[PDB]
Amino acid sequence: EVETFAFQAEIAQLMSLIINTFYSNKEIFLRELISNSSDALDKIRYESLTDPSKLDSGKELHINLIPNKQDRTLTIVDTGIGMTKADLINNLGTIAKSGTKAFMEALQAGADISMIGQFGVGFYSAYLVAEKVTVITKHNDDEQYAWESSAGGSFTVRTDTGEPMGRGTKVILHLKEDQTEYLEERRIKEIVKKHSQFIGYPITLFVE
Numbered sequence: 001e002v003e004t005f006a007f008q009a010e011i012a013q014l015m016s017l018i019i020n021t022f023y024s025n026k027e028i029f030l031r032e033l034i035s036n037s038s039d040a041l042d043k044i045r046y047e048s049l050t051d052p053s054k055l056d057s058g059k060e061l062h063i064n065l066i067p068n069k070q071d072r073t074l075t076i077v078d079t080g081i082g083m084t085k086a087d088l089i090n091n092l093g094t095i096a097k098s099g100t101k102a103f104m105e106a107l108q109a110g111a112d113i114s115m116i117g118q119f120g121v122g123f124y125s126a127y128l129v130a131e132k133v134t135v136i137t138k139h140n141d142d143e144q145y146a147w148e149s150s151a152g153g154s155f156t157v158r159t160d161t162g163e164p165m166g167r168g169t170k171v172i173l174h175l176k177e178d179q180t181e182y183l184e185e186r187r188i189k190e191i192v193k194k195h196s197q198f199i200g201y202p203i204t205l206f207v208e
C-alpha cells in the first residue's frame with residue numbers, strides 16, 4: 001500500500017523551475033547526486049567510529065554508477081547511511097525549504113542552476129534529465145523504503161519489497177527520451193572526471 005504526499009509549496013516551485021527553465025548544462029545533476037552520496041558515506045563512517053555494530057549491514061563504503069539502456073535508467077548507488085521514513089517524508093522537506101528560498105533569490109542576481117548544490121538542494125537537479133526519479137533507501141533504524149516522483153507536485157512512499165540492499169541509497173533516474181547520452185560510458189567518465197575526481201570513496205562505473 002502506497003501513501004501519496006504533496007511536496008511542500010517551495011519544493012514544487014523549485015521542481016518546475018528546473019523542469020521548465022531553458023538551461024543546456026544538465027550534466028551537473030550527476031555530481032550533485034554523487035556528492036550527496038559522499039555525505040551519506042561520511043556520516044556512517046563517523047557513526048561507526050563510536051559504535052562499530054553500525055557496519056553490521058555492510059562494511060564497504062562505495063559509490064556505483066549503473067546505466068541500463070534497456071530500462072533507460074541511470075542508477076546512483078551508495079552504501080552510506082540510508083534514510084528513514086521520516087527523512088524521506090518530513091525531514092528532507094523541512095530542510096530543503098530554506099535552501100530553496102535562498103537559491104531562488106540568488107537565481108535573479110544571476111546565479112544559475114549549477115549553483116544549486118551550494119544551497120543544499122542538489123538532488124532536485126536530477127529533474128534536469130529524469131522524468132521520474134525513484135529512491136530506494138535503507139537505514140539501520142528502519143525498513144527499506146521506495147520514494148518516487150514525476151514531479152507535478154506529489155510524491156509517493158511505500159515500503160520496498162525488491163532485492164534487499166543492506167544499507168544505503170539508490171537513486172534511479174528514469175531519463176527523458178532526449179537525455180540518453182548519460183547512459184554512455186565515455187559520456188559518464190567525462191563528467192565524473194571533470195566534476196567528481198576527488199571524492200573520498202571508490203566510484204565504479206558498471207559497463208552494460
Ligand SMILES: Nc1ncc(/N=N/c2ccccc2)c(-c2ccc(Cl)cc2Cl)n1
Nearest residue numbers: 036037040082083087091092123135169
Ligand atoms: N545518496 C544519498 N544518501 C542519503 C541521502 N539523505 N540523507 C539524509 C540524511 C538525514 C536526513 C535527510 C537525508 C541523500 C539525499 C540527500 C538530500 C536529498 Cl534532497 C535527497 C537525497 Cl536522496 N542521498
